Design a binder for this molecule. Structure first.
Ligand SMILES: Nc1cccc(Cn2ccc3c4c(N)nc(N)nc4ccc32)c1
Length: 159
């Protein structure tokens, strides 16, 4: 089954850099744990944003362009991306914006990290009608020395 995992700032703004405010160590650990030993699907910008395949995971890159790295699997369509995962309990879609939009209608689970920050970005996480989604887990954390902003993990399940 298909899950989306994403770090969202206020107004559901999403970005991707090794900088503020999506480089919080605790959001990274959450991300690792929830994607470990699962196939990950991602856009090209997100693939560059990591510069390296994620270990112990099958990495699948959805892009209209041909591939430039043989350590990972390149595909051109949503259904090709899904098939490339094989028979597995959970597929993890890890961004970016356009990829979320494409997989949301087929997703049955959302892993969201709400960061209590504001950053300027045109790229947003797709609007999920809260009538079709049920929150089933929440975990708020205060800012500390390692994590500059407060943050809250949430898991939602499609209703
Ligand atoms: N160095 C590195 C290792 C793993 C991932 C990345 C970039 N990256 C790529 C995706 C993510 C990411 C995500 N999809 N969701 C959440 N909640 N957090 C995330 C944090 C980082 C992400 C960078």
């Amino acid at each position: 089954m298909i899950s989306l995992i994403a770090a969202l700032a206020v107004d559901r703004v999403i970005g991707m850099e090794n900088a503020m405010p999506w480089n919080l160590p605790a959001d990274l650990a959450w991300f690792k744990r929830n994607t470990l030993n699962k196939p990950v699907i991602m856009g090209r910008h997100t693939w560059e944003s990591i510069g390296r395949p994620l270990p112990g995971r099958k990495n699948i890159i959805l892009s209209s362009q041909p591939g430039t790295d043989d350590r990972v699997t390149w595909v051109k369509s949503v259904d090709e991306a899904i098939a490339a995962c094989g028979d597995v309990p959970e597929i993890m879609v890890i961004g970016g914006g356009r990829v979320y939009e494409q997989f949301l209608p087929k997703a049955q689970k959302l892993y969201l990290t709400h960061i209590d920050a504001e950053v300027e970005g045109d790229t947003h996480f797709p609007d999920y009608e809260p009538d079709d989604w049920e929150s089933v887990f929440s975990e708020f954390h205060d800012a500390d020395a390692q994590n500059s902003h407060s943050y809250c993990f949430e898991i939602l399940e499609r209703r």
